[PDB]
Amino acid sequence: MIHELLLALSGYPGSIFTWNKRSGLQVSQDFPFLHPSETSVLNRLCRLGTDYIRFTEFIEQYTGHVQQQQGQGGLHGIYLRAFCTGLDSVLQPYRQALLDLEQEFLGDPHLSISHVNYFLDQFQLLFPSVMVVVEQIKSQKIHGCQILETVYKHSCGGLPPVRSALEKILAVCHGVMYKQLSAWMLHGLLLDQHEEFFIKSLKQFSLRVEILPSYIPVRVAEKILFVGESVQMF
Amino acid sequence: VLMKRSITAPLAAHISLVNKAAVDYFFVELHLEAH
Amino acid sequence: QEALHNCSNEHYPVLLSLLKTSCEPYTRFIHDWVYSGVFRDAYGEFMIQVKLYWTHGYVVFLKHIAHDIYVCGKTINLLKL
Numbered sequence A: 001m002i003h004e005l006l007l008a009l010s011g012y013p014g015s016i017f018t019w020n021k022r023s024g025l026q027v028s029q030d031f032p033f034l035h036p037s038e039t040s041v042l043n044r045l046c047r048l049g050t051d052y053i054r055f056t057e058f059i060e061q062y063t064g065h066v067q068q069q070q071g072q073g074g075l076h077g078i079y080l081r082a083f084c085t086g087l088d089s090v091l092q093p094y095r096q097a098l099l100d101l102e103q104e105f106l107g108d109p110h111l112s113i114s115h116v117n118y119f120l121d122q123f124q125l126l127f128p129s130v131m132v133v134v135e136q137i138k139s140q141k142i143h144g145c146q147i148l149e150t151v152y153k154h155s156c157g158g159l160p161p162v163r164s165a166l167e168k169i170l171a172v173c174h175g176v177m178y179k180q181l182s183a184w185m186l187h188g189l190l191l192d193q194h195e196e197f198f199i200k201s202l203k204q205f206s207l208r209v210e211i212l213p214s215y216i217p218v219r220v221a222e223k224i225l226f227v228g229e230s231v232q233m234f
Numbered sequence B: 001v002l003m004k005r006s007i008t009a010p011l012a013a014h015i016s017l018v019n020k021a022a023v024d025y026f027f028v029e030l031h032l033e034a035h
Numbered sequence C: 001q002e003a004l005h006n007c008s009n010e011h012y013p014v015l016l017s018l019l020k021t022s023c024e025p026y027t028r029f030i031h032d033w034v035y036s037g038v039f040r041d042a043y044g045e046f047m048i049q050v051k052l053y054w055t056h057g058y059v060v061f062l063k064h065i066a067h068d069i070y071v072c073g074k075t076i077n078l079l080k081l
Helices: A002-010 A036-062 A078-090 A092-107 A113-120 A126-139 A146-154 A160-184 A218-233 B009-030 C012-022 C024-033 C063-080
Strands: none
Touching (some): A002 A036, A002 A092, A002 A113, A036 A078, A036 A113, A036 A126, A078 A146, A092 A113, A126 A146, A146 A160, C012 C024, C024 C063
């Protein structure tokens, strides 16, 4: 029951915590050798594993599923892959924690489930918090640059771990924009087609307030457009 | 990404030399201007 | 074409290491007809293949350099005849 929870929690659901997809993990039920006092702690810990299995499934699903061939930035698109890239390396301390738990259980096998619970409760708040960002991106069909503002509005809050955790992901998805801008400004070459890096001679080149980040004002964007067109012409 | 700035330069430096020397081979030797 | 399409992914170095040696014999074939005047075709897989002298065929690498090589070899090959 002890080791089984760790295996379920890493993403290998057992014959005790039976994974469905419409309900996540579920215990096998009341038996006369168990009663609710341990059961509730186990369920509360099982929440985080439900979320974790969903996360790994999504990251796997959108990174490494094509040799890259439309207008799609949400079933495809470089920004979605960049988010999926950021999310797993932010998820690295969870794996490190589970790894720690196995070692402690090896040292003394009589350690409680509450012993697990208090160590993992630094994650108990942060794991619901990051979920609404990915849920927003999936539900509202948020693509292109719009993913940045979706993360950025919740990276101006008042909880330090949520802020740092979201900050690393925003660095990655900034990185794809920076990689396109680093060539287009000095040469004019773009690597993206049917996606925007918020700028789409003197025609076929369009600038829009809608695609541009809200937290980056219009004035710098107009200068960027001016630089790219100027170098492109001569 | 791929780029040609260390590939095409030591190639085009010989392409242009060959083409110009062919024009010169016409004129200072075979005298097309005389014809 | 996968290289200029994407380079912001973890599978960039593997595909780069594949292409870096898969482009190696083609570079040699381009490096032949221009520097030594020897036309060297492989299997039809090399892009250029073979009185008035119009007896060489011509039927993604950049086409902006293709015709320049195509004329840079044939003058020396005419001097061979």
